[PDB]
Enzyme design. Structure first.
Site, PDB file in Angstrom:
ATOM      1  CB  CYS B  32      -0.959  -0.281   1.307  1.00 40.99           C
ATOM      2  SG  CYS B  32      -2.163   1.109   1.286  1.00 40.99           S
ATOM      3  CB  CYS B  35       1.669   1.888   4.215  1.00 43.14           C
ATOM      4  SG  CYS B  35      -0.105   1.212   4.584  1.00 43.14           S
TER       5      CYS B  35
END
Lengths: 105, 105
Positions: B32, B35
């Protein structure tokens, strides 16, 4: 009924073969609670709307597809018509799923 | 600096050993995008606030911890004081992370 996607090539080939039909993709994770809660209803929709293609992408399996589609919540539903994204939302909301399908079909 | 959690026992033992200190947990996934964007700043905060404990839980590694903490977005930050959750939000917002730490410390 729901098509299980296990590569980026299979995701692309599916969006190609859909032609003019709406494609609904469920991006999910097996550990995530709401994903498990909505899976049966997503499968019932696939039996109800013959004319809409329903794909499932597990984000752990297809981290490349997940990354490229910029998913960051589960479940996320993305809607495609002729290779183009025409809608998206996240969260296990049954009424909203079906209401969006009926708006976009 | 940031403690890497690789089991539910280690997550629990950490919340115990924190005593009266604020614990900030980053629930993230490697694939992701947001992140990855916020990881350096989360590590700088850990050097800046000696008095706050910073934990990282990769949701693919600790699907049980992720499930039990009912995470469904990445990154999700959860804040704990003496085993109790006192705050939570998701999304890679730098200002909000630090502003929440300063409200809860």
């Amino acid at each position: 009924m729901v098509k299980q996607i296990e590569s980026k090539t299979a995701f692309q080939e599916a969006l190609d073969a859909a032609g003019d039909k709406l494609v609904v993709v469920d991006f999910s994770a097996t550990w995530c609670g709401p994903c498990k809660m909505i899976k049966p209803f997503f499968h019932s929709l696939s039996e109800k709307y013959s004319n809409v293609i329903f794909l499932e992408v597990d984000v752990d399996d297809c981290q490349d597809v997940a990354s490229e589609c910029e998913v960051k919540s589960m479940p996320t539903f993305q809607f495609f018509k002729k290779g183009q994204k025409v809608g998206e939302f996240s969260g296990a909301n049954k009424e909203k799923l079906e209401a969006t399908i009926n708006e976009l079909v």
